[PDB]
């Protein structure tokens, strides 16, 4: 009962919401983890999507740099859900330190471009 809330609200059936999140990531241009069934059956970790995005302002200037975004569906109440969206930071893939590990790692400061990529996610979601 207060205007700001974490994540993006959703309602309905969680598998349908998951399929929606994916279509959206797909059409915003991102890549993502995919669920893997453990001995015939899928598990709750299917609602944890690690995604990766080529940062457009970086791309426009001949830079190959990624934003790492982690998505997480939580159920607030029956039929009502939060899509939690989290920044794992950024990486120009051609530098650090000279190729030892990856995935954001190092910087952790700025909320941009994260917030600008969130705005893209939300646009896609709201126009399925």
């Amino acid at each position: 009962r207060n205007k700001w809330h974490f994540g993006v609200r959703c309602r309905g059936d969680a598998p349908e919401i998951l399929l929606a999140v994916y279509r959206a990531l797909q059409r915003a241009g991102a890549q993502f983890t995919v669920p893997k069934p453990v001995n015939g059956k899928y598990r709750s970790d299917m609602y944890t999507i690690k995604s990766r995005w080529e940062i457009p302002h970086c791309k426009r200037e001949g830079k190959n740099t990624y934003a790492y975004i982690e998505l997480q569906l939580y159920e607030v109440m029956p039929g009502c859900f939060m899509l939690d969206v989290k920044s794992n930071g950024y990486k120009d893939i051609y530098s650090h330190p000279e190729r030892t590990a990856d995935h954001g790692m190092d910087d952790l400061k700025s909320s941009f471009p994260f917030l600008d990529l969130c705005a893209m996610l939300v646009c896609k979601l709201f126009s399925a």
Partner: protein, 93 residues
């Protein structure tokens, strides 16, 4: 283990509803129940001032309906030893 892909998992298409409801998502934990922007702690001087955030919510997206046709998005980050919650107001499209 093969990380990233661009394909929509096939099973999530078409036949769907078999109550083998592929797991439920986790319940919302208590710490995501409240955003520090909601607590417009007003004082009488500094209006930018906020309670210190929760470390495990650094860099999580937060949102608010605007009634104005723009997105209101925010995230809290650490600058040196202090915290910046930036709220952005942005056109759609």
């Amino acid at each position: 283990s093969e990380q990233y892909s661009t394909e929509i998992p096939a099973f999530l298409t078409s036949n769907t509803l078999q109550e083998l409801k592929l797991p439920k998502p986790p319940s919302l934990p208590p710490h995501l129940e409240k955003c520090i922007l909601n607590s417009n702690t007003a004082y009488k001087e500094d209006q930018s001032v906020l309670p210190n955030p929760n470390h495990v919510l650094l860099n999580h997206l937060a949102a608010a309906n605007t009634q104005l046709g723009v997105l209101a998005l925010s995230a809290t980050t650490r600058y040196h030893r202090k915290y910046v919650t930036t709220a952005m107001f942005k056109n759609f499209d």
